[PDB]
Coordinates of C-alpha atoms in Angstrom, one line a residue:
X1 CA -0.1 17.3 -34.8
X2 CA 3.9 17.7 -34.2
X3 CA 4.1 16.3 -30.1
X4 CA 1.4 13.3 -31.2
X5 CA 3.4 12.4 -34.5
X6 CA 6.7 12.1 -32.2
X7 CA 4.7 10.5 -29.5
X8 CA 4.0 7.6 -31.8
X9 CA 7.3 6.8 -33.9
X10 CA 9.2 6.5 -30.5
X11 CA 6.8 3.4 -29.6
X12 CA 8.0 1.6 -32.9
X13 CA 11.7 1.8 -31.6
X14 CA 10.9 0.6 -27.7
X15 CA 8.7 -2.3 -29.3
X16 CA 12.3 -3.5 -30.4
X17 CA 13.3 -3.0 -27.4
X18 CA 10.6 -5.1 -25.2
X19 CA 11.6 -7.9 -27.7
X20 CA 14.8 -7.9 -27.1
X21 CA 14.9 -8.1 -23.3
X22 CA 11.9 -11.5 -24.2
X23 CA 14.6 -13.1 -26.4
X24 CA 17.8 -12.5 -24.0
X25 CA 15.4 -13.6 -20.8
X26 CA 14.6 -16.8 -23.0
X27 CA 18.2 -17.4 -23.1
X28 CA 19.3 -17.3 -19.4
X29 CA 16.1 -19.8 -19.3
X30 CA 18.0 -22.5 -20.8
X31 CA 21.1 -21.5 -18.8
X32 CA 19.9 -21.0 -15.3
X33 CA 18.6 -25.0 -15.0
X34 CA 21.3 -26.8 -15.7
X35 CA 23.7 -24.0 -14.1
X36 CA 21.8 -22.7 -10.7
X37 CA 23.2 -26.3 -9.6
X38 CA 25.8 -27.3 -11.7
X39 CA 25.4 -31.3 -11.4
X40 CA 26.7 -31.7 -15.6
X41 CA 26.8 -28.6 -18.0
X42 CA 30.7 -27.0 -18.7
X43 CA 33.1 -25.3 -16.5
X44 CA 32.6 -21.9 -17.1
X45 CA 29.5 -22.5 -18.4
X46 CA 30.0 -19.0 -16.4
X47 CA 32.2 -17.6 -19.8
X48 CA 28.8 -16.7 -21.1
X49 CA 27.4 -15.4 -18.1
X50 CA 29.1 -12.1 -17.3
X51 CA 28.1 -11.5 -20.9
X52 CA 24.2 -11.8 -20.7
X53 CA 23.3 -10.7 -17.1
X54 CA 25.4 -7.2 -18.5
X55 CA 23.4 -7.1 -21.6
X56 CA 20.2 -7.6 -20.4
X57 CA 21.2 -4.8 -17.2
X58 CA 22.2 -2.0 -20.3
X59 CA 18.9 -2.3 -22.2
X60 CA 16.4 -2.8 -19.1
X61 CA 18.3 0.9 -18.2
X62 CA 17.8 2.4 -21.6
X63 CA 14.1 1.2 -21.8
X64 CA 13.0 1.6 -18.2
X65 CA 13.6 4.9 -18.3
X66 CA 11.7 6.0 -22.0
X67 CA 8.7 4.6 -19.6
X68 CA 8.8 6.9 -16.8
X69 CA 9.2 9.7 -19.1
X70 CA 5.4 8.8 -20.3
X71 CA 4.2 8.3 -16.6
X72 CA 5.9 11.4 -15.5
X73 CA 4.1 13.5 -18.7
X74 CA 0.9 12.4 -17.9
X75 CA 1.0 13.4 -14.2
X76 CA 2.5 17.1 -15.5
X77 CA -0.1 17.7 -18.2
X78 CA -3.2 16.5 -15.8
X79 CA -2.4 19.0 -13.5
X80 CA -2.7 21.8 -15.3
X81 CA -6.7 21.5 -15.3
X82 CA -7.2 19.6 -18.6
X83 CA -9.6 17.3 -20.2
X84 CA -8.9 15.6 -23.7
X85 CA -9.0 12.8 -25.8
X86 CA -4.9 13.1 -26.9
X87 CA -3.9 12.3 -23.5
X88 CA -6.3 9.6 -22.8
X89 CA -4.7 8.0 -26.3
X90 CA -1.0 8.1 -23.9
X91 CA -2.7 5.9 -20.9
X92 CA -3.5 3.5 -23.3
X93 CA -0.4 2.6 -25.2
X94 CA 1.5 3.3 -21.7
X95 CA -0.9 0.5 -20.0
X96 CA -0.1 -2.0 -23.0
X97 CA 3.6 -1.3 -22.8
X98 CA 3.6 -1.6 -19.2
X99 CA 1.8 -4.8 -18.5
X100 CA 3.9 -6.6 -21.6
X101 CA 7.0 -5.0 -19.9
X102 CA 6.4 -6.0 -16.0
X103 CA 5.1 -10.4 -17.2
X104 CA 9.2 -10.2 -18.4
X105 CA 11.2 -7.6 -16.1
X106 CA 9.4 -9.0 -12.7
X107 CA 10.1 -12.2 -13.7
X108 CA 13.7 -11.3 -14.6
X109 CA 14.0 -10.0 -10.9
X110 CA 12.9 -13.8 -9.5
X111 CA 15.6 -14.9 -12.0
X112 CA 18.6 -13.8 -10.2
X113 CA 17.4 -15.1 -7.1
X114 CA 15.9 -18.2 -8.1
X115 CA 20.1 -18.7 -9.5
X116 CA 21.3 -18.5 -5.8
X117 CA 18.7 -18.9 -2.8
X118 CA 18.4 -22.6 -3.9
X119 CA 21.6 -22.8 -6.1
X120 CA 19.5 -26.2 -5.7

């Protein structure tokens, strides 16, 4: 009942988290465009960006990590010769959290790139 219970109400919190790196991303989006290549936007159109590449890098950190913690509990409690319902509940909600988290943090990693290897 207790390591279930905590189990779920640290999902809640990291949901907030996956929405928040969707929204930031969404945001260097509108940026990276017009900026990649600077042909009109501002000057430092770059006193913004120092700002949201940082941001995004401090959450992505505090999130990626909450992740392997699951992956890496799974793996210790298989192991041990067991077979049970309760952990197969874990690979579920890790699967769903995963696959929403990789559509938005592996496209954030052809971001940067896509910024500089055309800088079009």
């Amino acid at each position: 009942d207790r390591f279930m219970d905590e189990f779920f109400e640290q999902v809640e919190e990291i949901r907030g988290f996956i929405d928040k790196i969707a929204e930031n991303v969404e945001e260097v989006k509108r940026k990276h465009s017009a900026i990649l290549a600077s042909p009109n936007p501002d000057e430092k159109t770059k006193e913004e960006l120092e700002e949201l590449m940082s941001d995004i890098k401090k959450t992505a950190n505090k999130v990626r990590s909450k992740l392997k913690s699951i992956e890496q509990s799974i793996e210790q409690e298989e192991g041990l010769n067991r077979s049970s319902a309760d952990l197969r509940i874990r690979k579920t909600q890790h699967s769903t959290l995963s696959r929403k988290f990789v559509e938005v943090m592996s496209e954030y990693n052809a971001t940067q790139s896509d910024y500089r290897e055309r800088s079009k």
